[PDB]
Each structure stands twice: as C-alpha cells, then as structure tokens.
Design a protein around this nucleic acid. Structure first.
Lengths: 333, 225, 126, 116
RNA sequence: UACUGAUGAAUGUUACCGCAAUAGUAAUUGAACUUAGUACGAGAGGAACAGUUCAUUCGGAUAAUUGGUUUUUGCGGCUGUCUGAUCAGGCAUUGCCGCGAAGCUACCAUCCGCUGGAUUAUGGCUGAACGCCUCUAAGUCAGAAUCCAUGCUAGAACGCGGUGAU
RNA sequence: UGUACAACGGGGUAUUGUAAGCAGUAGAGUAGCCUUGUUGUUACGAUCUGCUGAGAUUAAGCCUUUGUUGUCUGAUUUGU
C-alpha cells in the first residue's frame, strides 16, 4: 500500500495533535488559527451549484456532508515558545486562575478519590496585584517568537457523558507578540464562539483519529481542503431552515443522530466526510495558506437540509409531518 | 441574414437551441458565444432566454412552440417553468404537458399556423396544441421516418426536409402546409435537418459545416433576400 | 460519473431500426487498466461490439456501439437513483451519426447530454 | 425540487431517497424505499395491501374526496411571481393543513363510532 | 539473528501540556470543456500557454448506501422425533427455507491525496584572459517530474522544557 | 453521597410478517344420519374476519429516561 503512512501503528491519544500551524500575516490583528469539536452524523444536502463553466452549472446537486458539533470553547491559559537551534522550546506557560471543574478533571486519572487540589497554591500566587503573574507575562512579552493559547471543551454543553475537557494548543497569526499576549490577557476565562473563527464558504482542514477495527485502524489522519457549508447557532431556532425551505426545524434528525444526541449548541457543516467516527474529537485548522482556486471561490446557496430519521428510514422531516400524513391514531384519541 | 456559428464545437444547433418569431431558447453552458450569436442577430427586439429543460443543455429538440405558445414535457422542473414565465410576455402562453414521450422537438414540427405531429401520440395533446398555439394539427410522417421534427425544418416562408423524400411526398405534404418544400442537406451532407439548423421567417442560423451549396438551397426556399 | 453495469462479454439488445437484434460486447473504449479485472461499461459509453443475431449485411463486422439502456442502479445528481428494464445499446459510426432512423424504448439522460445526434434520433427519453 | 408521491405508498418521496424505475413503455415508477420496490417486483396489487394509502382511499379508511384535497392539484399554468402572492400562500398552506387534519379527525370520529 | 510490533527498571516522586535531534516519506497518467476551427497552410489538415471539469492506477481514510456475510444462532413457515391431545418446541455433530439489525469485511462502495528555495542540461547579462570577440576565469539572471526544505508519519525508551500536586 | 453509578421499569427505534387462543352464523364439501335444517347435529372444513401493521427480538456493541431498587472503599507502593 502507501509506504508514507508508516509505521502504521496506534495513535497516542483520542485527541490527536496538529503537527503544523498556518504561517503568519503580521499586518493583521490577533486571530486564532484552529478550533475543536466532536464529529456527529452524516446528513444529506441538495443545493443549486453556482460553479461557472461546469457540466452541472446552475443545476441541483446532491452530496453527503457531516455535522461536527462545536461548543463555545473557553481559554484557560497562554504559552510562549522561543526559537532555538534545536527547534522550538516552551520557556513559560501561564494560567487563568479560575478554572472549570472540567479542566481540573483532566489533571486526574481518578477524580472521585482525589481531594480536588488542582490549582490551589497557584491561585494563591495570583492573589495580589500581579507581581509573579505579570512577570511571566512580561517574560513572554520579551522573548518567544510564537505564542500559543491553552483552551478546553465545554463538555457539559455536549450531550456526551465523557465529562473530561480536552486541552489543546492554538497559536496566533496576528503579528506583534505584544498584541498576542495582551489579547490573551483580555481573553482569560472567556468563552470563544464558533462563528468567531470560521465562516461559510471557507476551505478548511480537519484532524482526527480514524475508526479502529482490529493492527488496522486507529491512526491520526489529516485530510485537507473541505468547504464549510453552514456555521450554525444553537440559540437560533430553525437551523434546518434555509432561505428556500424556511420550515422551523433543527438540523438534528427525529430522535437525535445515530449514536449521538440533540444539538443544543453551535455546529459546523463540513463538505464530504471528516476522518474518525461519531463521539470522536476533531480539530479544524484553517488551510495553512491562501488556497485560491474556483473550488474555493464559490459562495454556496443551501437549498434544503435533510433531517429524516437516519435510524432506519425516513419519509418525513419533522414530527409535525408524521401526524399530518398519518392523521390521528389510537393512543392519541 | 443566414448566420453560421457553433455551440461547444458541435454542428447540431437545433439540438441546443429553439427559435421562434417572438423568442429564442438557449442552453446555459460555459460558452457565451452561442448566446452572443443570437444576441448579434436579434438584439433587444425579441427576448432570448437562458434556461434548461429537466436540467439538460439539450433544449431545442425537447420543446415545442410558436408566436402564440410554448409546450414543455413532463420532466420539466418547476423552477425552469417559473423562470420561463418570468422571461416571456403575455403574447406567448406556456404549458407543461403530462405525456409518455419527452422529445417534443422530435415530434412537433410547427410554425404560427400549421403543426405536424407523431401518429402514435395521445388525443389530449392534439386537443391542446390547436388551442394554445392557435394552429392546425396533423398526424403525418415523411418518407418512412417516424420522427418529423428531427427530419424537417419549418417556417411560414418555406420548408426543408431530408434528401431521401420522394417526389410524391413532396407535392402532397406541401399542399397540406400551403408552402413549397425542398429535400436538401445541412452541415456537409446530414439527414437530420431540424436538429442541424434553426429557422423562422427572417433568420436562419446554421452550424459551421453548412457549405455554400447548402446555404444557397436554404436561402432559396426560406427566401431571406 | 455514473455506475458501471455492462461487462466485457455481455449480450446487450438492439434499440434502433437498423436490422440487428443484439450486440456482444468484445472491448471497451476509454477504459481503466486494473489488475485481474476486465473493464466495465456504463450508459452513453462507446464499446466495440459484434452482431450475434442480425442480417448478413450488419453481421461479420466489428464496430463501435453507444449504450442507451443500462439496467444497473446508477446515480443522478438530482437525488434519486434509477435503472432501466434491460441491457441494451445502439450502433453508430465514430462520428456519432445513427444508422437507424428511430430508436424504440427509453434513452438515458446522461447519454442524451453527451451525444447530440442520439438526442436527435430519440423517440422517447426517460 | 419536487416532492413526489410513491407509486406504491403515495407517500412524500424526498431527494436522495428511494428508487425510480423506468419501464420500456416509459413512465415514472418512483418509490420511497426498497421494500415497496421489491413488492412491485413480485407483481402485487398496491390497493390490496392495507398499509399503503391506495387501500385507505378505496375502502374508505381515510377520506378520498374533500375540498382541501383538491387544492393539492398537480398545477400546470405558470405564474408571474408577485411578492405578496407568495406571501399569502405561506399562511394559506398552514391554514389548509389545519382544516385537512380537523376534517380527517371528524372522519375518524365517524369511523370510530359503532364501538359504543 | 535481522525484521514487524508490543511491555519495561532507571535518572526527587507523581501528573499534565509540549518542543524535535534523528529516521522514513508520495502520488501518477490520460481525456474533455473554453482558448479554435484562431495562429498556421494552395488546400488537406490543425496547435499551444492561460482558465476549468472528470477519469486511470497507486496510497490514506471511511460505512450513509451496495454486497460474501450471522452462532441477536432475531422472527415467520416446513420436517426427523414426541410428551394422553391442542399449547410448549424438549432435541436435530450449527436441521431445512423465507428475510434481518449488530458485526467480520470488500474497486463490490464514498471522501481525501501541498508550496518555497537551491540546481543540472540550456538560454542569457555584465566581461577578461588575448588593445577584437567570447554565458565565466572574478560576478550575476532565468530554468528539469531533480535536489532540499514546507507538509505528513514516528518521537531519542540514557535528548530537552514549562506547568499542577505535599 | 451526588442532574454519582449500576440493575430494572418506561419511551423512542428498527426486525420478522399477521401469534396461540377466543367470538363465530361465514367455509365447495360433507365420516355418518334424520322429523334433509331461509338454528342441521356429532368430529371437520383446503379458510375469512374482530383482537391482527398484531405477537415476538426490541441490544446481548441502539439511544433517551420526571419512575423503582441496589451501591459508594479494600490492599500495596512512592516523594535526593
């Protein structure tokens, strides 16, 4: 087979780490480079294709897409990395004082017996006008070429019972390192939204650990160039409603996804299929560069979203459609 | 007046376009030169419509119509039908026909006054053609070729059929149409003359392989100058 | 792209009024080169075929053939999947000009879009 | 887009679902799922089998002729599109859905009577 | 004993986040649309750059459909064998048949499969040797699917850092 | 020792193809008889209806759960 994917062996964790990051544009202000979420289901989309010079120009096209459940991810720290003759080197990490129960759970393999003594004397180290905290922020403000942000998942918002927040690193491609640490200063403990990283019609790339079977499977894979079709919002009702369809419905199928619950928060609808399976954590990066082709150019018009019960079969979209067709039954009246 | 152009480097113009006295239909491909050919000849006098039928470029040999009406097959989508009505004034009517067959361009070889159809067609279509288009319907064939829209190019000035037509069929069918008929070729010796070129009373657009002897025949019978 | 249903060594019937009854597929034009697998044809694909049952004029002659009926579940970009009743193909020259004047039975939408003269010589499409 | 009725069920067939068959006689045979298609292969009368709507329209389990059911005609004549002429249809379809369900509920009570 | 892989004591303990010395590496070929029936040519014929759309094989993923599937040994039907007879199937080296989720798992399916430097061959520029000339000796510009990085895979079990816990 | 966990109960969900039995007056015929029954009887009737899109698997690798019940601490080792 493929000689490049060797050794074809098992990954270190469920949360795979991103080996590279996008380059830099110093002229821009501070922006995140990647965002994390959980893979959940495979839905059907039909839409009119506004692709010029095509065999399917202005025609309706069917294609299967995936909906990654993405909760608002919250910052709990920031890191500085110096440039060395031996690569990079973390000189200092610094944290946000008031951490959730979820991140505190990550630092223990046995949460139940533990006395929950996580960031106690470190929070006592904060307890003043800075002096030690502001010193280490100044340390990163002096040296360290690349500045990475420590974030975690709001797992309680997620319908999964895993209850253990995944820590990841996301660098910043907004130049002048002083602004990087000052952005992170303003954004300690703060919850970062999904639409405040990606928009619709953007080519992106996802990282994941691939569906294990028996050694075969359970590798970390990175597939590139995937178009985000819909950046949804949980507080916004009628997510399944397009500009065309406009029927008040959630993107979630009747009785949740296959092996996954309801979507009571933000979501990303990625073209095709992301690696890994449902209940698996993914991290969406932003393409590394300007990927300008006509595959990237077109701004899509989503016509209709399939929300039929994938569990078995589906002839209906909403529960309203079931009783509209069936009429009334015995247990009803 | 007799124009000579192409679509996606193909000689069969009547496949990918249908032209009347009041309108012209064109496919939506990558090339805009085919649309620019009719835009040069007709201009802003009569509307030229960018559209498809059942999501296909093959538009000319799938439809039927004249100055009074327009007829499309069962396979036509609702959005195409929506845009077609949005494009065309009240002088022209539009109606979808629920049918067995879909090739209306291969069946209905019509103008403003006389329509020639397939003998195997249902009665309801014949009842609807005469009402909407304001024409006379005739279940007639030419020289043992069952498709008549494919093998006949037709307008109010003159008519053109494939060269395999007998003299008996020429004189008899011309008496029905009230206009003279010539059995000639289009696009360097091809039988399919309806699909080979589009025609009306003031324009005759052909494919690029239509020779000067073929052009002289077309100019003579359809009487351009 | 559409799914493949007509293998090498298959008897597809004749749909036009040329004279032949059936066509035996001997070779596929515009094919892939897989290991331990013969090429497979789909709707609208040109394939070399010999006349098994037909007139002496049409027979004893190897010639190309454009497929009009696939009968194996293919894909439309408009959602729904479809397949015809029987495996069948028509014969034409390298230019695409039909020997027959009229074609009986359904001719596929993919074949009709690809070949202009096939769409011209069609009686009933879909 | 178009929401079709099944040849077997007369149920709403959505894009990306079911199988359409085309006969040599050339008319559409759209299905909702492979089960109904396999029943059609076995040459079964759709009206005979009870779980479809073909039985219910014939036997009279659910009403066949109604003023709400005539409104869902396969419309032929195309319209010029006015903004308010579509804005009215949004509220209209929502209203006629209520009347269709209520008159079916009235038919249900005319069917369930005889138990007492 | 190489080789695929898997544990493992030890360098305050334990835990969490990482850095990357090194080593491996990956995509391949064709067709079509516009450029066109334009340059070009008596004609016959007939390009390409730029802009796009697919497919081949290879490789990496993946089960939503398809498919050999199966010991839900899921339910219907039939049988060898009976229980005092309907019931209950008690049983049949895995009894037969109809169909089936979960799984085993496949070009039998679907998705994905990258940009910066430095060069060879060569084409140059400035310009000696050798009062002319010369791509070269001292410089310098462009340039091959090459090379080396970017990206990707693994992380030195004696390579290293930051941070939580007394 | 708390939207903590497990076992059930419920719901959603698909699979099979119409459960045994009961109500039967329907059921060509009839084993045998009559006081040959627009109530035939005593066993049946190749079957059809109401229960019957039911019975049953309904996670042993489904999901949800305002219900119920049972649980929540043994041993060892480490910190120049």
């Amino acid at each position: 087979g493929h000689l490049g994917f060797l050794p074809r062996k098992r990954a270190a964790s469920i949360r795979a780490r991103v080996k590279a990051f996008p380059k830099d544009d110093r002229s821009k202000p501070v922006a995140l480079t990647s965002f994390l979420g959980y893979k959940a289901g495979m839905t059907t989309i039909v839409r009119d294709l506004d692709r010029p010079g095509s065999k399917f120009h202005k025609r309706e096209v069917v294609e299967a897409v995936t909906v990654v459940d993405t909760p608002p991810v919250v910052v709990v720290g920031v890191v500085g990395y110096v440039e060395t003759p031996r690569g990079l080197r973390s000189l200092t990490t610094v944290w946000a004082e008031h951490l959730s129960d979820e991140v505190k759970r990550r630092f223990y393999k046995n949460w139940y017996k533990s006395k929950k003594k996580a960031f106690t004397k470190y929070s006592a180290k904060y307890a003043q006008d800075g002096a030690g905290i502001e010193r280490e922020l100044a340390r990163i403000k002096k040296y360290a070429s690349v500045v990475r942000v420590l974030v975690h998942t709001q797992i309680r918002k997620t319908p999964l019972a895993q209850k253990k927040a995944h820590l990841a690193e996301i660098q910043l491609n907004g130049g002048s390192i002083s602004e990087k640490v000052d952005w992170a200063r303003e954004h300690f403990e703060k919850t970062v939204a999904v639409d405040s990283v990606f928009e619709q019609n953007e080519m992106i790339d996802a990282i994941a650990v691939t569906k294990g079977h028996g050694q075969r499977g359970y590798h970390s894979r990175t597939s590139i160039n995937h178009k985000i079709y819909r950046v949804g919002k949980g507080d916004d009702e009628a997510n399944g409603a397009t500009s065309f369809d406009r029927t008040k419905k959630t993107i979630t199928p009747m009785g949740g996804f296959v092996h996954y619950g309801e979507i009571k928060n933000d979501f990303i609808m990625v073209k095709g299929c992301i690696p890994g399976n449902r209940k698996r954590i993914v991290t969406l990066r932003k393409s590394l560069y300007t990927n300008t082709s006509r595959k990237a150019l077109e701004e899509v018009s989503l016509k209709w979203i399939d929300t039929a019960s994938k569990f078995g079969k589906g002839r209906f979209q909403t529960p309203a459609e079931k009783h509209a067709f069936m009429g009334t039954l015995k247990k009803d009246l | 007046m007799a124009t000579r152009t192409q679509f996606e480097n193909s000689n069969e113009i009547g496949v990918f376009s249908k032209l009347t006295n009041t309108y012209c239909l064109v496919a939506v491909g990558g090339s805009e030169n085919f649309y620019s050919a009719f835009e040069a000849e007709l201009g802003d006098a009569i509307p030229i419509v960018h559209t498809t039928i059942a999501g296909t470029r093959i538009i000319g040999r799938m439809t039927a119509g004249n100055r009074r009406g327009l007829l499309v097959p069962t396979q036509t989508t609702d959005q195409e039908l929506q845009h077609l009505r949005n494009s065309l004034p009240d002088s022209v009517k539009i109606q979808r026909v629920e049918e067995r067959l879909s090739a209306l361009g291969n069946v209905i070889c019509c103008n403003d006054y006389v329509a020639l159809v397939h003998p195997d067609i249902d009665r309801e279509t014949e009842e609807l053609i005469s009402d909407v288009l304001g024409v006379e319907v005739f279940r007639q064939t030419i020289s043992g070729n069952i498709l008549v829209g494919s093998y006949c190019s037709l307008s109010n000035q003159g008519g053109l059929v494939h060269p395999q037509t007998s003299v008996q069929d020429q004189e008899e069918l011309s008496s029905l149409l009230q206009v003279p008929l010539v059995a000639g070729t289009v696009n360097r010796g091809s039988s399919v003359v309806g699909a080979g070129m589009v025609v009306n009373d003031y324009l005759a657009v052909t494919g690029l392989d239509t020779t000067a002897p073929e052009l002289s025949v077309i100019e003579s019978i359809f009487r351009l100058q | 792209r559409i799914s493949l249903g007509l293998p090498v060594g298959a008897i597809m019937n004749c749909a036009d009024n040329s004279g032949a009854r059936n066509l035996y597929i001997i070779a596929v034009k515009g094919s892939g080169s897989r290991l331990n697998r013969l090429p497979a044809a789909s709707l609208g694909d040109m394939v070399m075929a010999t006349v098994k049952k037909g007139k002496p004029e049409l027979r004893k002659k190897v010639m190309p053939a454009i497929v009009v009926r696939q009968a194996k579940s293919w894909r439309r970009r408009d959602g729904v999947f479809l397949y015809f009743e029987d495996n069948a193909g028509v014969i034409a020259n390298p230019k695409g000009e039909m020997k027959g004047s009229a074609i009986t039975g359904p001719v596929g939408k993919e074949c009709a879009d690809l070949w202009p003269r096939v769409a011209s010589n069609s009686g009933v499409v879909v | 887009m178009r929401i079709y009725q099944c040849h077997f069920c007369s149920s709403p067939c959505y894009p990306g679902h079911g199988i359409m068959f085309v006969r040599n006689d050339a008319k559409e045979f759209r299905f909702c799922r492979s089960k109904c298609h396999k029943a059609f292969k076995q040459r079964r009368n759709p009206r005979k089998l009870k779980w479809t709507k073909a039985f219910r329209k014939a036997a009279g389990k659910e009403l066949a002729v109604d003023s709400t059911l005539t409104f869902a005609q396969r419309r032929n004549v195309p319209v010029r599109y006015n903004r308010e002429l579509v804005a009215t249809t949004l509220k209209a379809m929502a209203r006629i859905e209520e009347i269709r369900q209520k008159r079916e509920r009235a038919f249900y009570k005319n069917r369930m009577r005889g138990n007492k």
